[PDB]
């Protein structure tokens with residue numbers, strides 16, 4: 001399918017025989033699913049996100065059907081806020097990110113989808129994250145007014161400053177919208193700006 005990003009990219013998956021809903025997440029290295037039992041052997045791991053680390057169980061070589069497309073790979077199980085399909089399995093199903101519905105750059109997901117952005121006069125690197133509602137930038141002295149906000153994900157919540165109507169050029173494509181500023185470990189471009197540049201998921 002071709003999937004636009006006006007709403008969260010939620011799909012049905014089948015894993016262990018069970019149907020579950022999960023988010024297609026270009027900003028996730030790995031696939032992480034809420035607590036459940038998987039047939040077999042696992043090992044403990046820690047993984048990180050916007051707001052810290054959590055402990056998970058790693059299962060290897062697990063068959064997963066994602067909207068009808070077959071994958072077999074690593075699934076992490078633990079207290080994730082949302083079930084997420086990460087790049088380890090998105091690559092198996094042939095998923096790419098495409099600008100302007102395919103006329104613009106194609107970005108494969110073998111490595112993190114990092115691109116150059118321009119914001120407040122400054123050039124920065126940022127991750128294109130289909131699993132982020134909002135755009136979150138590293139502490140930057142933007143002039144202007146703001147409101148407090150808290151945003152969540154793996155590890156909990158962080159406090160940020162919400163600025164509106166901020167221009168953000170992404171790989172040469174102009175966007176303008178809300179930007180959240182705070183201590184994120186990676187600059188994140190979320191769906192609020194990805195939609196403005198005609199970014200789609202395709203497989």
Ligand SMILES: CCCC[C@@H](CN[C@@H](CCCC)C(=O)N[C@@H](CCC(N)=O)C(=O)N[C@@H](CCCNC(N)=[NH2+])C(N)=O)NC(=O)[C@@H](NC(=O)[C@@H](NC(C)=O)[C@@H](C)O)[C@@H](C)CC
Nearest residue numbers: 027028029030047048049050081131132133134151152153
């Ligand atoms: C789970 C919640 C939905 C997915 C998540 C994906 N964001 C990326 C951001 C990249 C990091 C800042 C992510 O967490 N990636 C993880 C996913 C876990 C994974 N293992 O793949 C990752 O790739 N982690 C690497 C990063 C390295 C960690 N550090 C280290 N190894 N030293 C890893 N392998 O652990 N989205 C988010 O966290 C966003 N949350 C949301 O969009 C919504 N919040 C919630 C709770 O649903 C909305 C209501 O705010 C944040 C940014 C706010 C806008």
